[model samples]
Target: CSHYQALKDQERMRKYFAAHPSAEVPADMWPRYMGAFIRRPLVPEREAATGRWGMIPPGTRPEKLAEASKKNTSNARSETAHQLWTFRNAWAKAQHCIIPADAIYEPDWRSGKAVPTRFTRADGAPLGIAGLWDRYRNAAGEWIDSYTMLTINADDDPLFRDYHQAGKEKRMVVILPDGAYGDWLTAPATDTRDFLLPYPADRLVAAAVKL
Candidate 1:
């Protein structure tokens, strides 16, 4: 099974590259694009507003949010994003951003019940989530900005989906390993025309929901 999976993964990578010749970044910029930024906890009013997990409008100050405590959208899944009403355009254009998440919170679907868990890198370096951003203008001419994270097909980690029932959902976030962030970010759209490959499973770590 391991050998078969490896071969399958390799074939997929080959097909992706063949279809997307432009996705490769300029050799010189690749390192810089991935490493230029440092990781920090996203703030609701600013970074989060701009395109972090939270759905607050960027232009609105933290204190000024209409429903500060109300449940606002935090994370938008990568799957269906390109076709989804809110995220389709942003995915094609608009605000293209990178979300630096120390870890992500996901819920386990156990026998129709949800038990949430937080997944992180065992090595402790942050993960850069591939993102799409948008800015909306209200009837009153107010501007609000937000972002969505990308997800792809799940891989070899058997422990991950043991909690969730199979086939209900087939995707998760498109995470950039610490080593691949630069290439994923700075690579031009032309270069990324077929930029939908999943990250390597070995580089990721998932633990049962702490909550």
Candidate 2:
């Protein structure tokens, strides 16, 4: 239920790219992170790349991406991500990434029916959600980089707990603090557990959207 989003603020994306000269930004579009080409931070080189959103495993065929994405690979849970077959390798290898967004959508089920709600930082800055990245090759062995956002239990979160559907466990994406951006990408493979915790609810705000 957290799939839809928008990056209408071009200036936010512009400031991010200005800091990373090596990043390849083909186009600037406001759309779903998984729909249009998106940008993400890569480890070691510290460069970001524009690519598709779905986290495609090494051997998965391109044609199967739709089916694979629908089965919960878009957002990896922190508690079991390292133990899950689809994410184990990436997690163990510390294939970390940052998925930047102006705001994210979630379903507010407080009403009888689900209503779309948009969540944003109180300060109005962009969010750098924690994620995992992997490289996949096509039939011709062309390398492709993709990623999935990491989520954590948010049943007690003051804001996020109210989103999602009824009878479903509340979850929120791992939103890294400003200074921890580089640390997340370069931290020891086993030492970055501290970054997976919930962000302070006071720093975030949510409102119901018409769409």
Candidate 3:
């Protein structure tokens, strides 16, 4: 898996935890120690737990679990969680989670089948990908990882999909509205039921790159 480019990732996290030591993390049992831990609110619900980077569905056979070198998924689209069978049951109020990411990579096969193109916010801010979290147990009785990123169509979808579109997979990642983040995060179950619609078309901007 070393070929997958995880070296920079490890260093980034090391830098983050270095500034905010986990040894000082606080527990609810000690209410007065709240500030000892630095926490951010989950997308909408300020009280929910932030999701782990990987996902593992409940009741899955350990032998079937995938290795990171294979197809690894980390973001669950807001549009398909409740409808996709792999995430259907978990999506019923149990699959919500937030992925704090700085950018996302979308492959562009325009130049050739082997090339890829990455996409990011023009302003250079972290993207909280709408996601779902599921956990599985390994032989050691410890939970392992798995996840899926949700995809929906974009207004002016980049020209790259002309290649991947043969399979009917034409959507892009679900990037939510900043104003709607609160509603998307904390509305009542009934209100949150329709979270999968395409992100508002007017708020997005996209460009094709040679990366």
Candidate 4:
């Protein structure tokens, strides 16, 4: 599960926006950890909008917010995301989004323990992970937005399959191809299902980390 990540490469993000004129520049924030609010590009605007890392379903009772927030809802499983109670409505509504990051962290249990591992593009490019977003209205009538990255089974993937615990099933976030960024945000919800696949291992570089 890619519950934790960091987007510290502002220059790469800026270069991406330069090439993609329609893309919006995210705020000058860096090295963000999970649970901390961050920005994502959503449908209508396709511009960066602030949102929490874990998605908050619409109509959730204010009193239950704290409890709901405790669960690890940061990564929605692609296979059943559209059927899951917390993600179905957003998936059905096609609340698609893009999360830009230079690298992603995963747990490496090859040594019989969890070691932090980092995955980055071999070409030194930022990754555009497919995600879902939702806006919840609080009792005060204010809207709180949040997002969750979509993940697919990675047992067959060479790179991603090696990250999780030795005996546990592995899963990876859907990394969109550069050409499909616009289509992902604008294409019919049904047509976008074909994009949910693992990124080629050849294009990625990974390393075990101390943290």
Candidate 5:
């Protein structure tokens, strides 16, 4: 499962993504659908902050799928995101953030069993994952901050088409180019679609081996 991933260190996060985090992380490889730094652009009274990778939707889920929102809300489908529970609130507010994933493990099942393969940029640069932030109250008067990564259907993607299981819809995380970081961080709902394009095949690559 993609419950964990390698993250860009604070230095490199700022170096590539151009945002510094408020808290110090213990290690580079951290679990998502768990914890990972959300690169904040700017909040009048706040510095760059860390938000939970699994966003806790502030409002109740619309109708069905309420309880399921609790798990794997780590990613929002760009196609239907505007109406989804976790992303609906953030999208309405345009609370954009850049998730710094140095590398992510995708299960390669060409063989009988699952083989986790590390995917990264061929140039060794970080992937600027587009995300949305939301603030939630645990109902005890305590507030929680969290963010969710944006994703698109990848069945037609040149490189990412091979990801995910065969029975499921292949999904690829939105990796914005360095050129789009500025706009992506504060993009409006209307134009956000333009930034969700696929990463070029030449830049994205699969690597590593253990046998």
Candidate 6:
């Protein structure tokens, strides 16, 4: 799973995701439940919002969010995201977002033991992962943002198919190119599928590492 990631320096967001709202410094995001920023949908000019990694779907009691996330709401399967009870609302509303990352971490078990691995763009550029965001009303009556990354089956993907437990199905996050960022955020509901296609298998580079 893409449960772990690193977002590098704060200044890089402005450099790569310039169209976004004053980029919040989401530096070194390493936890699965911490705060991060996402470029929001609908707003053309004043876009982007800070949100927690584990998504708290709208109308849900914030306390119960623990259970929601326990089942791992951090990632929504792209094939059924629009129909699922926890994510359908945001999916239907087109609450899309883009998550920036310097690299993503996954585990490699080929050596008979789990070895943390790092995946980064081969071109030395940052990643723009697709996601959905929602606003949850907190106990203080303030709306807090939370988000989940969108994922697609990678069983057939040349590179990603090798990730995760070899016995289980492989999965990967949807990554968008820089130019397509705007089109993806404002894409009409019906036209969005055009953008969810697979990433070029040759675009990534991976290496095993010490966690």
Best by TM-score: 6
Any idea what lDDT model 5 has? 0.70
Per-residue lDDT of 48-72 in model 5, one digit per residue for the tens? 5666667777864345334644477
lDDT of 3 by residue, 1-211 (tens): 0001111232333333222222322221111111111123432322323233344556656565545213344444546666654576656754443333444455445565644444445554434445455556765667643444555554355432443424455666555544555455554435544555555433433445443
Candidate achieving the largest lDDT: 6
Predicted candidate 2 versus true structure: per-residue lDDT over 1-211, tens digit per residue: 3453534345565565323423443233222243322333434333345545666666677786555555656777888888876677778888887776667778877787878787789998877778887777655668877677889888998878877776877888888887887678766669757899888989988888885
- Residue 199 alpha-carbon offset, candidate 1, angstroms: 2.6
- Candidate 2 vs candidate 4: which has greater lDDT? 4
Pairs of residues at least 3 apart in sequence or in different chains that clash in candidate 2: none
Question: Residue 6 in candidate 3 has what lDDT?
Answer: 14
Question: Judged by lDDT relative to the true structure, which candidate is superior, 2 or 3?
Answer: 2
Candidate 3: misplaced stretches above 4 Å?
A: 1-54, 66-80, 83-85, 144-146, 154-167, 187-189, 197-211
**Candidate 4: clashing pairs of residues:** none
User: How would you encode candidate 4's per-residue C-alpha lDDT over 67-139 as one tens digit per residue?
Assistant: 7777677889988888887788888888887777767778887798888887888987777788888887666
Q: 161 in model 3: Cα distance from truth in Å?
A: 5.5
Q: What is the lDDT of residue 18 in candidate 6?
A: 60
Candidate 5 ranges with C-alpha deviation above 4 Å: 4-8, 26-40, 43-47, 60-69, 208-211
lDDT of 6 at 174: 86
Worst 10-residue stretch by lDDT in candidate 1? Answer: 1-10
